Ligand SMILES: C[C@H](C(=O)N1CCC[C@H](C(N)=O)C1)c1cn(C)nc1C(F)(F)F
């Protein structure tokens with residue numbers, strides 16, 4: 001579990017969104033596994049606006065932050081899970097690292113701010129849903 005809190009927005013994995021998230025929906029995209037809802041209080045996270053391919057992510061199944069090199073956001077085939085059938089997920093970045101079901105939502109960050117959140121795993125690989133192209137998170 002985990003979310004990004006930027007301005008008056010909460011960014012979570014679409015597959016982990018709560019009823020309150022759906023009742024205060026701003027935007028959702030199943031192909032990216034992302035959902036954004038509105039919040040009453042202002043958040044402290046800042047979104048990175050860069051093309052970094054190195055950063056650090058939080059892994060809840062190890063209570064540890066790991067430095068990683070990750071690929072550029074792309075269209076990647078993801079195996080069937082309890083939340084989606086086997087399909088192509090867009091805006092996904094892969095890295096070598098530990099992940100388990102329960103780790104989705106952990107933040108990946110670079111020197112510029114938040115890059116994205118854990119969204120996929122398996123095989124000693126971890127995938128992150130990028131948020132750096134969502135420029136509207138910084139305003140309104
Ligand atoms: C099976 C699951 C996963 O990749 N997804 C489940 C939830 C839906 C995901 C998607 N974005 O489509 C696919 C996974 C396997 N390992 C070892 N770690 C994970 C994870 F970190 F919890 F994501």
Ligand SMILES: [Zn+2]
Pocket residue numbers: 048049050051052110111112113
């Ligand atoms: Zn950066």
